mmCIF file of C-alpha atoms in Angstrom:
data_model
loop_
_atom_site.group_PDB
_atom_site.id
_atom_site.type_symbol
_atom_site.label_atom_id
_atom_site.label_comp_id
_atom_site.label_asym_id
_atom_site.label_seq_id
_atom_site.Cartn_x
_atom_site.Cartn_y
_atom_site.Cartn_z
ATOM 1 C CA UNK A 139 26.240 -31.079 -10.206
ATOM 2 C CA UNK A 140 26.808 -28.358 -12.704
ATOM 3 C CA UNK A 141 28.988 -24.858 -11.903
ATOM 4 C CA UNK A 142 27.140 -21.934 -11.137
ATOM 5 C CA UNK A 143 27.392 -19.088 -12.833
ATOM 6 C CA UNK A 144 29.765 -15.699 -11.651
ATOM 7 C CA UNK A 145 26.590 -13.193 -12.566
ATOM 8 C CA UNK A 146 28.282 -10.048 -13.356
ATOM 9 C CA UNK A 147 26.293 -6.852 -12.650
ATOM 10 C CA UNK A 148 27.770 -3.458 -12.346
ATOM 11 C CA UNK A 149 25.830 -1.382 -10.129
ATOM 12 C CA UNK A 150 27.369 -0.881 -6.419
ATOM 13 C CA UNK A 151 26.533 -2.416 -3.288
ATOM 14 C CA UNK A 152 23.753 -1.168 -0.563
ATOM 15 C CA UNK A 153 22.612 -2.483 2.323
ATOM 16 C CA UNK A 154 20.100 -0.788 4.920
ATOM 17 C CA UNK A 155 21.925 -0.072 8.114
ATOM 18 C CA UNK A 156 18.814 -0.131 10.210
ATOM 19 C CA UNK A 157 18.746 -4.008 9.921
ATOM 20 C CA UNK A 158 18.992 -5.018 13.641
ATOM 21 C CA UNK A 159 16.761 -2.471 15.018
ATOM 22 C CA UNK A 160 14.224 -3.531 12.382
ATOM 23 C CA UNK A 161 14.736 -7.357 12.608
ATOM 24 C CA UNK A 162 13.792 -7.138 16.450
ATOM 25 C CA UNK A 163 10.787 -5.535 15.503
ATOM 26 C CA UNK A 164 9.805 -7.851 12.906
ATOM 27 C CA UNK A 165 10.018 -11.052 15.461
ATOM 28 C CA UNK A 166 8.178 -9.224 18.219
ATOM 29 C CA UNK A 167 5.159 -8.504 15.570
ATOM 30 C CA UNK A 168 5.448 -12.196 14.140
ATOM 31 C CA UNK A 169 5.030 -13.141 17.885
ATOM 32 C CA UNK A 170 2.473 -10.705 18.952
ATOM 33 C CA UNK A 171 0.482 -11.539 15.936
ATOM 34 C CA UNK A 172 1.442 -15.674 16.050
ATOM 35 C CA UNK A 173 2.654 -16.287 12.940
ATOM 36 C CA UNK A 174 5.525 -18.432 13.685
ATOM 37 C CA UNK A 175 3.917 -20.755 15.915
ATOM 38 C CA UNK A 176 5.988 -24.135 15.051
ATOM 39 C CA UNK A 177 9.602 -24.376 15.601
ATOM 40 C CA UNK A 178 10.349 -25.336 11.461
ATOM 41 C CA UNK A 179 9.031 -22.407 10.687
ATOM 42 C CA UNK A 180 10.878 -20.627 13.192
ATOM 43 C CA UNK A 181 14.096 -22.167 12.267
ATOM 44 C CA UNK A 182 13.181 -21.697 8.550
ATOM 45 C CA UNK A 183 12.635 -18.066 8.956
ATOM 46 C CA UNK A 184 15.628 -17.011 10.053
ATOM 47 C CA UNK A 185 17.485 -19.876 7.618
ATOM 48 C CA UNK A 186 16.572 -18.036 4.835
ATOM 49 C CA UNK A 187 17.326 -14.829 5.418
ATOM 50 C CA UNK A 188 14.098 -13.352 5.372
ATOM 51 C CA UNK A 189 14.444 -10.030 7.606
ATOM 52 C CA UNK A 190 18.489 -9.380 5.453
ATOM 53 C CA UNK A 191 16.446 -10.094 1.948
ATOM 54 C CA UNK A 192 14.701 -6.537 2.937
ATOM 55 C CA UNK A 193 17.580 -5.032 3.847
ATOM 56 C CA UNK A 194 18.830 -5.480 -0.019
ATOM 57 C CA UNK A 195 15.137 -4.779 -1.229
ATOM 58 C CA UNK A 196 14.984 -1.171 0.918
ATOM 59 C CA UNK A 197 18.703 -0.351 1.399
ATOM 60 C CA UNK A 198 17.528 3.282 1.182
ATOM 61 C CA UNK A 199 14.508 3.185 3.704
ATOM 62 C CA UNK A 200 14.457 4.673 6.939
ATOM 63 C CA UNK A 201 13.615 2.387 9.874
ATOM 64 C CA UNK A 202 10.121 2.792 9.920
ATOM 65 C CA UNK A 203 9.758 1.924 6.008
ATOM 66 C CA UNK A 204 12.073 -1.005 6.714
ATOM 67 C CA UNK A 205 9.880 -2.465 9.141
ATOM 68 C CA UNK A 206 6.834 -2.207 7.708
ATOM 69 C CA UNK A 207 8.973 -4.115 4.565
ATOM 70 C CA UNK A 208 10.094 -6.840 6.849
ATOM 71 C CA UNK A 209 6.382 -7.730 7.951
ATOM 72 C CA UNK A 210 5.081 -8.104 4.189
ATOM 73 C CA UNK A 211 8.033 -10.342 3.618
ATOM 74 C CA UNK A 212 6.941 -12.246 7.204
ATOM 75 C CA UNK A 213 3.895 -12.409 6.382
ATOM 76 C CA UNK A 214 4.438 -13.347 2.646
ATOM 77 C CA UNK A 215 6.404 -16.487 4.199
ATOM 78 C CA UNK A 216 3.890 -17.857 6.103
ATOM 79 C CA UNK A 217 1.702 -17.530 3.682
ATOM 80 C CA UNK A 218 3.584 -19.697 1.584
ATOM 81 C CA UNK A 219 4.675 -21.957 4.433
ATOM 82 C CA UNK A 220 0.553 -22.854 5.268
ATOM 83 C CA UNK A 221 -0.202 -23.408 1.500
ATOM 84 C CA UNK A 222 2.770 -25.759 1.241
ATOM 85 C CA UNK A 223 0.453 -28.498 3.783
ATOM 86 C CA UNK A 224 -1.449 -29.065 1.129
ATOM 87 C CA UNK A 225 -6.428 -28.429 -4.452
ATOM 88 C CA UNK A 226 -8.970 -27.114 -2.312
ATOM 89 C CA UNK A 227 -7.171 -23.944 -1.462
ATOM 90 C CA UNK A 228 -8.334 -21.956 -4.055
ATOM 91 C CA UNK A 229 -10.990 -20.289 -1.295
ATOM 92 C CA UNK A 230 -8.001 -18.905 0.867
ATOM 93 C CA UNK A 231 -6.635 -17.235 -1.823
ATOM 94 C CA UNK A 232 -9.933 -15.778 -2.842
ATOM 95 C CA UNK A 233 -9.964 -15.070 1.044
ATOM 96 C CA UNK A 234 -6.741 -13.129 1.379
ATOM 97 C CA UNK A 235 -7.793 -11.264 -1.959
ATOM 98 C CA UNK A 236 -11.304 -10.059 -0.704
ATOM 99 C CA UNK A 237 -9.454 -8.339 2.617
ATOM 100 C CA UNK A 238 -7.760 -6.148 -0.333
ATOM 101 C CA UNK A 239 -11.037 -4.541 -1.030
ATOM 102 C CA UNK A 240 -11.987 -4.645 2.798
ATOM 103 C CA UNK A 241 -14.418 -7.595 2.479
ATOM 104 C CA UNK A 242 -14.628 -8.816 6.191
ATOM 105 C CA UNK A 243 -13.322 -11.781 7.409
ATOM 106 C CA UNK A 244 -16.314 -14.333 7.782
ATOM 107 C CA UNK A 245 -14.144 -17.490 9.927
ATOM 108 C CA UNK A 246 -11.649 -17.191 12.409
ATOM 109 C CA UNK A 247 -8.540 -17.074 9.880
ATOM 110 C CA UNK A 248 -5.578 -16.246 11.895
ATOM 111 C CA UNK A 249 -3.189 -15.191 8.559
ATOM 112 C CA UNK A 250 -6.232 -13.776 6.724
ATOM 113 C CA UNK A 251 -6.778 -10.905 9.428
ATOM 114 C CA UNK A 252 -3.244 -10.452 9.945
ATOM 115 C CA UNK A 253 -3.107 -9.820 6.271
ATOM 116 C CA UNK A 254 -6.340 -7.343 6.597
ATOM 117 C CA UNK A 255 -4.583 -5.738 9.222
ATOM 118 C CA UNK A 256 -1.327 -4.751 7.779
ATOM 119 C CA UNK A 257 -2.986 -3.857 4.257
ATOM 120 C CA UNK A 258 -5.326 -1.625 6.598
ATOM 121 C CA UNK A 259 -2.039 -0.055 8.041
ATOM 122 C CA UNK A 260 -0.039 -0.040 4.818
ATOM 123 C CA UNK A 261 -2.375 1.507 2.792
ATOM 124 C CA UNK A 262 -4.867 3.706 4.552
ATOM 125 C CA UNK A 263 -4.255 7.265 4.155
ATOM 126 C CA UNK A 264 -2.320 6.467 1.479
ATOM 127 C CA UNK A 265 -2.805 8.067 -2.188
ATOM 128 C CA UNK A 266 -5.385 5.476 -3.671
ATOM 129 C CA UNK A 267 -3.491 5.938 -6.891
ATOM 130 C CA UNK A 268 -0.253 4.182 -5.144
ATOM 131 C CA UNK A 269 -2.725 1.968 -3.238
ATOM 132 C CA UNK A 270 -4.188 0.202 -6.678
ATOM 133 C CA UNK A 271 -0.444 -0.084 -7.825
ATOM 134 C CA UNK A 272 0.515 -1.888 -4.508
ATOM 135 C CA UNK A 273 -2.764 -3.927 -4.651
ATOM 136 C CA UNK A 274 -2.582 -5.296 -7.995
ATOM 137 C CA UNK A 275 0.898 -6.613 -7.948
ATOM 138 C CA UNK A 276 0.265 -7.974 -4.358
ATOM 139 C CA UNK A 277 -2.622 -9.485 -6.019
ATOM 140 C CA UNK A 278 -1.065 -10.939 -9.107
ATOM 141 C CA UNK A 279 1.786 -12.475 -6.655
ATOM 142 C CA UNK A 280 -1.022 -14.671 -5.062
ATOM 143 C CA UNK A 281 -2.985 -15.431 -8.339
ATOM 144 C CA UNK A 282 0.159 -17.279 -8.913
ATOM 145 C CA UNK A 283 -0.431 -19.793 -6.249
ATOM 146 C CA UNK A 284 -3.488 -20.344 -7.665
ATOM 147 C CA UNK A 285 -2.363 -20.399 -11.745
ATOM 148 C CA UNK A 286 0.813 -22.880 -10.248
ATOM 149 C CA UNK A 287 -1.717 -25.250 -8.766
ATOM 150 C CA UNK A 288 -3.993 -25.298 -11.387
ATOM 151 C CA UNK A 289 -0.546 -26.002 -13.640
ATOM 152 C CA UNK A 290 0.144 -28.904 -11.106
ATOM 153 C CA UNK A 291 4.742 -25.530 -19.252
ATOM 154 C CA UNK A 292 5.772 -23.030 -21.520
ATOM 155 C CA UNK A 293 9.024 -20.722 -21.451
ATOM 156 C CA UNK A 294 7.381 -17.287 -22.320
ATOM 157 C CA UNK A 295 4.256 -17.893 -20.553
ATOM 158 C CA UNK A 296 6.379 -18.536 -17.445
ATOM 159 C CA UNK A 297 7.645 -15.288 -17.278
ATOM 160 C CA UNK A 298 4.915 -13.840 -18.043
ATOM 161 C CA UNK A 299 3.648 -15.294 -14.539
ATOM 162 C CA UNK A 300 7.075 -15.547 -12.590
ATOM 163 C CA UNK A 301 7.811 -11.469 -13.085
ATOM 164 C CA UNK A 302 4.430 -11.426 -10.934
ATOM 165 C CA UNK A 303 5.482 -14.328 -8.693
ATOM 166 C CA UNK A 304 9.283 -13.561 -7.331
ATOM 167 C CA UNK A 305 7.324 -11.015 -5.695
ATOM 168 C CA UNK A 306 9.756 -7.777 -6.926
ATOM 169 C CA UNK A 307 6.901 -5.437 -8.165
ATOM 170 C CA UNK A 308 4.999 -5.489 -5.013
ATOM 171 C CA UNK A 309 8.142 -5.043 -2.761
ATOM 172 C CA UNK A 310 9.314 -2.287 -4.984
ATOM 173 C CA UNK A 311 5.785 -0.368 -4.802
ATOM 174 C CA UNK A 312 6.928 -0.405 -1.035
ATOM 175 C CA UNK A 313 10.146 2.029 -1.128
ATOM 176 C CA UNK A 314 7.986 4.639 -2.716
ATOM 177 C CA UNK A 315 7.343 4.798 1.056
ATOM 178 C CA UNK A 316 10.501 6.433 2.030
ATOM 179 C CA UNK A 317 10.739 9.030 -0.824
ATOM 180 C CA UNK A 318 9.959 12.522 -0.234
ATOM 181 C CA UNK A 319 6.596 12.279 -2.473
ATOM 182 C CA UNK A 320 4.939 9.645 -4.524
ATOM 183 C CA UNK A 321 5.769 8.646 -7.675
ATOM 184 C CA UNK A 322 3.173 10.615 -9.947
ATOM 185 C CA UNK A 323 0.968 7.805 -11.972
ATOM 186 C CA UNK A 324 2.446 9.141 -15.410
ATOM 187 C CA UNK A 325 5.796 8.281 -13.799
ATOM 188 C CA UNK A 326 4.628 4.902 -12.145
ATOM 189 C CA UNK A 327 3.183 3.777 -15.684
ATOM 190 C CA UNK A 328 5.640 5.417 -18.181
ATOM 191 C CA UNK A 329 7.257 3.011 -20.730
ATOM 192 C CA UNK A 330 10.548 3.412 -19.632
ATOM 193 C CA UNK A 331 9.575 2.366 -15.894
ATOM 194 C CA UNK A 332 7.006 -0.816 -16.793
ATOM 195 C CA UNK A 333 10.394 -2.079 -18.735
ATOM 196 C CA UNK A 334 12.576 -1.625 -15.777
ATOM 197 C CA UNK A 335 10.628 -3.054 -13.948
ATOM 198 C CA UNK A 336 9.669 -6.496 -15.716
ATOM 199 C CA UNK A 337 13.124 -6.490 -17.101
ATOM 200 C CA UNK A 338 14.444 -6.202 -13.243
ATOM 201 C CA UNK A 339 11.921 -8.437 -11.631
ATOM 202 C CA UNK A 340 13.199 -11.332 -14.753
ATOM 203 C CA UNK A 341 16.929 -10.839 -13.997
ATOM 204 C CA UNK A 342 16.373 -11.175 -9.700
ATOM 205 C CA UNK A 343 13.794 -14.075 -10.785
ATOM 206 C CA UNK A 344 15.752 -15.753 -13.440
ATOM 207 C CA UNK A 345 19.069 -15.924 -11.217
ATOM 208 C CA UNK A 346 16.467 -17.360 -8.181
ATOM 209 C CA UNK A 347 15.987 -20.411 -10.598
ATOM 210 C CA UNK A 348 19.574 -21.074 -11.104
ATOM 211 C CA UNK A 349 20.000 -20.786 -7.582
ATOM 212 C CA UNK A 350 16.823 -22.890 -6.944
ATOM 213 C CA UNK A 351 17.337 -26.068 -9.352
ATOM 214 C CA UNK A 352 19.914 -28.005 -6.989
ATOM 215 C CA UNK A 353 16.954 -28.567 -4.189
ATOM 216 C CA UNK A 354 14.050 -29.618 -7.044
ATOM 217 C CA UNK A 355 8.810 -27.974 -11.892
ATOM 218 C CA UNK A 356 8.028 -24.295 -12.411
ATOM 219 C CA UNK A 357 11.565 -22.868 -13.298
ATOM 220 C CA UNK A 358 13.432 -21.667 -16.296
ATOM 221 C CA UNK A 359 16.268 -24.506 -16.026
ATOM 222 C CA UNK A 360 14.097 -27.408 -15.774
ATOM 223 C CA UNK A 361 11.383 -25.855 -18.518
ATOM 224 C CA UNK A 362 14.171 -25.640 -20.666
ATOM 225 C CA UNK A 363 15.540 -29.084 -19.673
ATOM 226 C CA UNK A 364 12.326 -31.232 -20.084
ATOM 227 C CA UNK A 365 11.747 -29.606 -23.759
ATOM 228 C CA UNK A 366 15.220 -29.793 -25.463
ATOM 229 C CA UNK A 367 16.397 -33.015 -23.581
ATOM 230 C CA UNK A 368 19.930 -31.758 -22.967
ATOM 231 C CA UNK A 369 22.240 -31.316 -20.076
ATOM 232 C CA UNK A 370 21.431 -29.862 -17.064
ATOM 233 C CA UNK A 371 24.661 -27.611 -17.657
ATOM 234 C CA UNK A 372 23.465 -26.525 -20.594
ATOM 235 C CA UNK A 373 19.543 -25.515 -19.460
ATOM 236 C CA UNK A 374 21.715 -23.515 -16.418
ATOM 237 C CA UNK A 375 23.955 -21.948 -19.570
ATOM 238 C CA UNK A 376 20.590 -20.706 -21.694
ATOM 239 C CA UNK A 377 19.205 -19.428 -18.667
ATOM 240 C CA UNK A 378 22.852 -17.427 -17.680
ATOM 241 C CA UNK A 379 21.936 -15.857 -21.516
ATOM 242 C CA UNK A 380 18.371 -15.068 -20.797
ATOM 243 C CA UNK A 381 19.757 -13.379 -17.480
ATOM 244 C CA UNK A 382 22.027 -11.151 -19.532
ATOM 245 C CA UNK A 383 19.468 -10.417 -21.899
ATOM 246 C CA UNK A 384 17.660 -8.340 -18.652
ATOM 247 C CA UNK A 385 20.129 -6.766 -17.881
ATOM 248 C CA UNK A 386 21.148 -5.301 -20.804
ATOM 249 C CA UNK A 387 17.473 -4.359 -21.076
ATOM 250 C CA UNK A 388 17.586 -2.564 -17.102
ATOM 251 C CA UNK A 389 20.506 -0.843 -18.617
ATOM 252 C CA UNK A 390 18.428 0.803 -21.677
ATOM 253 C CA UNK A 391 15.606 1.252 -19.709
ATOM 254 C CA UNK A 392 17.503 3.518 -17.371
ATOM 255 C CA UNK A 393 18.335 5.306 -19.790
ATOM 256 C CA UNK A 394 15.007 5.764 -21.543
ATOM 257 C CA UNK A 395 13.909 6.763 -18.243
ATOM 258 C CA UNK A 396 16.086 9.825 -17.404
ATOM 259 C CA UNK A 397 14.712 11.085 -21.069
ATOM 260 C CA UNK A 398 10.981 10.180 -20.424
ATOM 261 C CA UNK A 399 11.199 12.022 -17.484
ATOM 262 C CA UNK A 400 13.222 15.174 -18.869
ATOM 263 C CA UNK A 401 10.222 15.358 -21.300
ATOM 264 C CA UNK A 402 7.730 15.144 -18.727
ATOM 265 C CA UNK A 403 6.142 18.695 -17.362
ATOM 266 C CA UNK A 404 7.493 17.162 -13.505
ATOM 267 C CA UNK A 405 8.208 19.283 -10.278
ATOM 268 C CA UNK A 406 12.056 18.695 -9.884
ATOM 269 C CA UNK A 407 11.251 16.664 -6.492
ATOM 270 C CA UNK A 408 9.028 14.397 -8.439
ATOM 271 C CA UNK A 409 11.907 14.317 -10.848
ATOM 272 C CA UNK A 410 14.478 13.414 -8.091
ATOM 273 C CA UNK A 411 12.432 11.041 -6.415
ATOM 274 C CA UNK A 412 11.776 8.639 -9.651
ATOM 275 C CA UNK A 413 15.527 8.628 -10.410
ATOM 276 C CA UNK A 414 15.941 7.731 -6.574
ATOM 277 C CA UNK A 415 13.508 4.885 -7.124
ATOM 278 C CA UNK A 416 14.953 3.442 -10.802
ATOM 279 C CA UNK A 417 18.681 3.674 -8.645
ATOM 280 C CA UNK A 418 17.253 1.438 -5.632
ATOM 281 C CA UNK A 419 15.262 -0.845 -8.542
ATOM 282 C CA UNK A 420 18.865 -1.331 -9.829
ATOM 283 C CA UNK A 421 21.159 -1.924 -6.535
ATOM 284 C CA UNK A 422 18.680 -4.658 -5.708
ATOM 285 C CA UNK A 423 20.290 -6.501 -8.590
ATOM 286 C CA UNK A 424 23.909 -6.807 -6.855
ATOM 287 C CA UNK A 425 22.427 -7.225 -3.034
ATOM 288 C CA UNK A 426 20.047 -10.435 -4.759
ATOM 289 C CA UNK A 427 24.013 -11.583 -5.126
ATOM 290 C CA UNK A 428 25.323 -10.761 -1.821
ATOM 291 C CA UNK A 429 22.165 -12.254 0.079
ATOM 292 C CA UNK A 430 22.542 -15.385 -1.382
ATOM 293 C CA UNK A 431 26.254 -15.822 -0.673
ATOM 294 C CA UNK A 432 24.868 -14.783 2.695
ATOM 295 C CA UNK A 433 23.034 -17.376 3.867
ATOM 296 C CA UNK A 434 24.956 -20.061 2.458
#
């Protein structure tokens, strides 16, 4: 027992108003494609709050962008749910990673061509350039299942890995869906950008593990717990300063970023749409809040 901390974080509240329309067609392409089959993961699906969770992610989105969001995050749970029945499932991640780069499915595989199928609908007639952005942080999320099994710790190598592993830089590659145009790569890459983003990802992640600790160990309480030897209160406290440390580094980088891009020779609507972007990057940090009041 230990009292949770009242995160403070400034920027307002969004929340994507296409959330029922979307939800119905996330659950009719779970069933259509079988992914729920078992009642606990039924009941667990819908106990976590995993079609609200991308109404905080997307708040912006249209309904089309929304659903395609929900059926990552569907898919990303079961996923999860049929690694968590088992050290010899190291080949099924080297599976799902393989239908990234269109290697065929050899078995039957029910998730591993569901996955080949939405990547072929996400990301075909897409720009390549956004494609090997989405890919690569889709792909680092599941190398951590297989670095966190291998494991199975160190603070700043955790985060290293956990950044990758809450799941953030993947799921933000997916709103440049609903702006007008693409990011352009020096945009995507800039400095400003790659510190908003880890520095965001940290904060959403970071708050997950205070969260987390009551059910549990990969997590920045108990790493810091099982090192110093203190009390549980004070691990939860260290990680409360850690959590304020990102956001005062989201804040700069916002900053930094409406100057990188002044700088930049940009078309204004590139222009708009990355400040669009770094906005919805930000709001995500206040819905995390609101979702997990939520589902309490």
């Amino acid at each position: 027992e230990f009292e949770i901390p009242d995160f403070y974080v400034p920027f307002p509240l969004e929340c994507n108003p296409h959330l029922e329309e979307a939800s119905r067609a996330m659950w009719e392409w779970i069933d259509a494609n079988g992914l729920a089959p078992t009642e606990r993961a039924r009941d667990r699906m819908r106990r976590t709050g995993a079609d609200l969770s991308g109404a905080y992610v997307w708040p912006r989105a249209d309904l089309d962008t929304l659903t395609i969001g929900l059926k990552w995050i569907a898919l990303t749970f079961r996923i999860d749910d049929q690694i968590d029945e088992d050290p010899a499932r190291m080949t099924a991640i080297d599976e799902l990673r393989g239908t990234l780069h269109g290697l065929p499915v050899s078995g039957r595989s029910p998730t591993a061509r569901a996955l080949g199928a939405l990547w072929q609908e996400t990301a075909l007639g897409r720009p390549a350039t956004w494609c090997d952005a989405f890919i690569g942080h889709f792909e680092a999320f599941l190398q951590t299942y297989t670095t966190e099994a291998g494991l199975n710790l160190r603070l700043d190598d955790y985060l290293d890995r956990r950044m990758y592993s809450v799941g953030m830089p993947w799921l933000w590659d997916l709103d440049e869906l609903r702006l007008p145009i693409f990011l352009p790569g020096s945009v995507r890459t800039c400095g400003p950008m790659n510190k908003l983003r880890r520095a965001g990802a940290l904060h959403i992640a970071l708050v997950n593990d205070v969260f987390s600790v009551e059910r549990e160990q990969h997590n920045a309480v108990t790493i810091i717990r099982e090192a110093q030897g203190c009390s549980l209160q004070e691990a939860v406290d260290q990680v409360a300063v850690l959590v304020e440390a990102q956001l005062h580094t989201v804040l700069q980088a916002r900053q930094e970023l409406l100057e990188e891009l002044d700088r930049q020779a940009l078309p204004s609507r590139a222009r708009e749409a990355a400040v669009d972007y770094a906005a919805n990057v930000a709001a995500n940090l206040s819905g995390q809040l609101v979702w997990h009041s939520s589902v309490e």
